[PDB]
Design a protein around this ligand. Structure first.
Ligand SMILES: Cc1c(NC(=O)c2cc3c(s2)CCCC3)cccc1-c1cn(C)c(=O)c(Nc2ccc([C@@H]3C(=O)N(C)CCN3C)cc2)n1
Length: 263
């Protein structure tokens, strides 16, 4: 429980699934982001009841959830600040600057975070470049892990809703709402594709339902120009139809490190 008196609001960062997010400082020194949770946007009682595990998740490649302010309305979620914003926009804006080594390093950053989450049996549930953030030194970190569970918005929570991350979902999520470590694995593959395509929309020009239909029948994302065959093999392994044939994040990290060593 953070004392809201210790927070200084400094800048509007935009709006996300829970409403307004602001940049500020904690105790005049530490850079933070502060989600001000819009009333009715979140299952607050449920989040508060369950939130301690999420705060104890600690890793260099996670965007840390520092604490909460719950003795007030609206409630706040205080996290680590990331000066370069979300990875999807960062890729798009610096598109002509990246070397292939840096793209691989981004994949490694995310994979390390996810390997940690996997070891804690904690699901992200909405992994995608938009839910990775970038610090002032270009380090990529995974953000808002586990929060999708508390979203109150039928357009997001229903698999036929317009905000559901269909393009990041395996068949068993689309058909059965069966989330597991292996649905995060699928999403990580799509994320690697977002990285190597330098921020393109997966299945662009397909609607969500067309995407569902086509992946169910075995359609997969093509190899981006900048991805080597070894890199494509890694992302492709995430997309096995059967969840039990997909690798673990431990295995993916080993795969990524091996490519780095060869390069
Ligand atoms: C995480 C986030 C959101 N998204 C969310 O809060 C949620 C996503 C999900 C939720 S809530 C529940 C379900 C799962 C998905 C919205 C706006 C800012 C930030 C955000 C957070 N953090 C932790 C940051 O460090 C950060 N940094 C940042 C943002 C914007 C800019 C900068 C800017 O100031 N503006 C105004 C736009 C251009 N941009 C580059 C720079 C850094 N943004």
């Amino acid at each position: 429980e953070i004392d809201p008196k210790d927070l200084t609001f400094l800048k509007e960062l935009g709006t996300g699934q829970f409403g307004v997010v602001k940049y500020g400082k904690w105790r005049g020194q530490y850079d933070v982001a502060i989600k001000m949770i819009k009333e009715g946007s979140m299952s607050e009682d449920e989040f508060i009841e369950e939130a301690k595990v999420m705060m104890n998740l600690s890793h260099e490649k996670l965007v840390q959830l520092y604490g909460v302010c719950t003795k007030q309305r609206p409630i706040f979620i205080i996290t680590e600040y990331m000066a370069n914003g979300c990875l999807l926009n960062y890729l798009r804006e610096m598109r002509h600057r990246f070397q292939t080594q840096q793209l691989l390093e981004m994949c490694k950053d995310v994979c390390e975070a996810m390997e940690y989450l996997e070891s804690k049996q904690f699901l992200h549930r909405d992994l995608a470049a938009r839910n990775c953030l970038v610090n002032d030194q270009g380090v990529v970190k995974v953000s808002d892990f586990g929060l999708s569970r508390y979203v109150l918005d039928d357009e997001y929570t229903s698999s036929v809703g317009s905000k559901f991350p269909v393009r990041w979902s395996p068949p068993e999520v689309l058909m059965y709402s069966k989330f597991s470590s292996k649905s995060d694995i699928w999403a990580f593959g799509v994320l690697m594709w977002e990285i190597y395509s330098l921020g393109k929309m997966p299945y662009e020009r397909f609607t969500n339902s067309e995407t569902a239909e086509h992946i169910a029948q075995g359609l997969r994302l093509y190899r981006p120009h900048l991805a080597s065959e070894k890199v494509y093999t890694i992302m492709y392994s995430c997309w096995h139809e059967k969840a039990d044939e997909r690798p673990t994040f431990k295995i993916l990290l080993s795969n990524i490190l091996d490519v780095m060593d060869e390069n």
